[PDB]
Symmetry: D3
Subunit: 110 residues, 6 copies
Amino acid sequence: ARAPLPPGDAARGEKLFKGRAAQCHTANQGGANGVGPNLYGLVGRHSGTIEGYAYSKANAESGVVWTPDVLDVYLENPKKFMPGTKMSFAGMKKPQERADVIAYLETLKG
Amino acid sequence: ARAPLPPGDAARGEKLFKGRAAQCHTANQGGANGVGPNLYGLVGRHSGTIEGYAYSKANAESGVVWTPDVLDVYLENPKKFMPGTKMSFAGMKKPQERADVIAYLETLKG
Amino acid sequence: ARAPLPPGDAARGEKLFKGRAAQCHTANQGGANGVGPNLYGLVGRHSGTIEGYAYSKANAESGVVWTPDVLDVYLENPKKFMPGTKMSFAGMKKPQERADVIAYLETLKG
Amino acid sequence: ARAPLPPGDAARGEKLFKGRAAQCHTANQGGANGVGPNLYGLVGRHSGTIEGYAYSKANAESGVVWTPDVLDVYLENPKKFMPGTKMSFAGMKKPQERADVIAYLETLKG
Amino acid sequence: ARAPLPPGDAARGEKLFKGRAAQCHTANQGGANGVGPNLYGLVGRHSGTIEGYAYSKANAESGVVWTPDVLDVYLENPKKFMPGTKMSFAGMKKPQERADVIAYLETLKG
Amino acid sequence: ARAPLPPGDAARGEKLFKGRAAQCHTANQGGANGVGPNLYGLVGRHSGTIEGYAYSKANAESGVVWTPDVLDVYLENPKKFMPGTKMSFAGMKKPQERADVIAYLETLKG
Ligand code: HEC
Ligand code: HEC
Ligand code: HEC
Ligand code: HEC
Ligand code: HEC
Ligand code: HEC
């Protein structure tokens, strides 16, 4: 069983997002796929279904829903959570940092 | 059979290209590969042969020639046309926009 | 357009199947997957959906229905029809042999 | 709660193994790789390390140990447990049959 | 620089072939592809070109010619020679055994 | 004999790097993965191990050390050196340019 995350701060999460995700992921409504998929409205989505994106077999078949609890374990270590993913991200060790990024992703709605 | 496209406008095509392709594709002569291949001189080329580019099995084996009529069907829905492609683009569903992009691609020569 | 096939003979089809497919494909009801999927009840099926089978991206995404006319084109040259397939079969180039195999596949029902 | 893994019968297990697995997997000491890896001494192994076998990225990176409890969940639905696997097996859907196969696997030691 | 192999014995090589390759590879003229390609007339062939076979990217692109010197190093350890191959064979440590198998492959002509 | 690797100019190397590599590869300490991995401290590394990067099977299994002499051969033609790589780079075909880039890479240390 995992610890719950501390409350996330979306402004800190945006800063972390720009530093750690933005070169592969756009975050704006209608933004383009690139190395990775656009992430607007990611939170709560069924995995492997962003419009236009061609996923690995692992991510296509992964069958999770991206709620914050699932994002927490995934973002800690993507390879461990989803072996076979083509997302080239080692992970974020710090619980507050993961909480902040998740809180930022949560604002990508409207 | 396929409905013909309307006449394309290259300037609108360029605008559409920069909004919808430019983050994966360069368009200048001798431009680099990135997410996707450089597209200078694309139109009329045998598929899966751009200098330097490491294609999916599907795109390497595809055996088409990118004439305008073929580009029409492909750009409407890449996954339907070339299942197994790693091009993360859903397609352009509006005939005029598809025609405009094709008209732009046609200018990439000299 | 496609030249029609001659009428197939299922008994010749079975002989051809055992010589050219049987080492990758079972044909009995509830037969197992191996190199390739079990083919009982193949004809008329949506492509890439046989119980249990782990397909290539190309075959998973292919979106055809294996009607006889589609099987004709596919079995003549699988790589041309479905570039990116992992089916290691060059094709049957003789119309009568292709028709016979199709006639055999059509018997796999009940 | 997940159903407790029932006591397995190894003789029934072998019967189930030969009907559902043997076309891809050998079970004898020093038996060959084929579609899937030789499974002698599988129980207790780190995943994705059987001598000579070229795994999918998902199975190579899976990082589990094949204890009986892990096999229970995996064998029920391989695709759910290991999305991205190339193992073409839908799963042992009946819990007693699944337990019997595990009991058979457990005997492959010496 | 490698040692030359000792003279190979084709009868011993056939025995080794049946024990170590035959479940993935046929050896007869006109024999079928299976897990791996038919190997009749393999010796001296450009790599990645057997009729009908769908290779990994690595083997498709490998650009070697299968002369006995190249078969020697490859068969010792396929992964080391061709990283990314999907051939699930660890290798043969013993120079006489590799020589024998190569001498057997050399007879697959006529 | 293979041409000796000429003395490289690192400033010319950086210029060549920014024109030919930077769209896929960062070069700064702690820079992000993108299309390809961050290359800080690349020289002398075991291949296929840069933190966070999800490699092709060929690059993951490559088993080389990126000394300058190995980089020379690789960078001349990546596809020839590492068949199966997903690096979309045809190669540095001019030996002085190839040496300059290596000299630049050598400076990425501290
Ligand atoms: C490029 C080097 C990336 C970095 C850095 C990050 N991500 Fe990523 N991501 C990337 C790819 C190529 C993919 C698809 C993976 C596949 O196996 O197909 C992803 C996927 C995600 C997902 C899942 C999307 C879905 O299921 O629809 C999420 C939620 C995601 N990525 C988020 C994410 C975050 C929060 C990152 C840093 C803080 C991050 N990614 C880094 C490519 C890259
Ligand atoms: C990144 C998310 C991409 C976007 C958006 C678009 N393209 Fe693309 N394209 C991309 C990749 C990775 C590839 C290779 C695909 C593979 O399976 O190997 C491609 C391929 C093409 C091709 C074919 C090139 C060839 O056969 O040589 C064409 C003609 C092409 N792409 C054009 C194109 C256009 C016109 C786009 C939007 C208007 C577009 N692409 C989007 C990556 C991405
Ligand atoms: C092994 C060397 C094979 C031989 C010979 C043949 N088939 Fe095959 N087939 C094989 C594989 C591995 C797959 C999956 C391909 C993938 O890319 O995922 C297939 C697929 C088919 C299909 C499609 C099934 C579906 O969409 O559900 C059909 C209809 C099919 N194969 C039929 C077929 C016939 C009639 C053959 C010879 C007469 C034949 N196959 C040869 C493996 C191999
Ligand atoms: C062919 C159609 C298969 C059938 C039926 C079964 N297995 Fe399998 N298995 C197969 C492949 C190709 C692989 C490698 C998968 C990959 O993604 O690389 C596997 C893998 C396993 C493993 C894991 C081995 C390891 O981690 O070292 C186990 C434990 C395993 N298979 C067992 C198993 C059992 C018990 C089956 C039926 C009762 C079964 N497999 C079916 C190919 C096929
Ligand atoms: C299944 C478990 C295999 C065993 C055992 C052996 N081989 Fe194999 N081989 C296999 C596959 C799936 C492939 C294609 C690999 C790819 O990456 O695409 C191969 C390939 C070869 C080749 C190269 C063929 C070519 O380039 O055209 C050769 C020469 C070869 N295999 C020979 C060989 C020998 C001599 C073996 C044991 C003594 C052997 N293989 C074992 C599958 C399997
Ligand atoms: C994108 C179009 C690229 C260009 C241009 C270049 N590289 Fe690259 N590189 C890229 C990818 C996607 C990968 C991973 C390849 C895989 O098969 O997994 C690489 C890999 C390298 C490596 C090896 C890294 C390692 O083993 O850890 C090196 C040393 C490397 N690339 C260097 C390099 C140089 C010097 C380039 C131009 C001068 C260059 N790359 C171009 C993507 C792309």
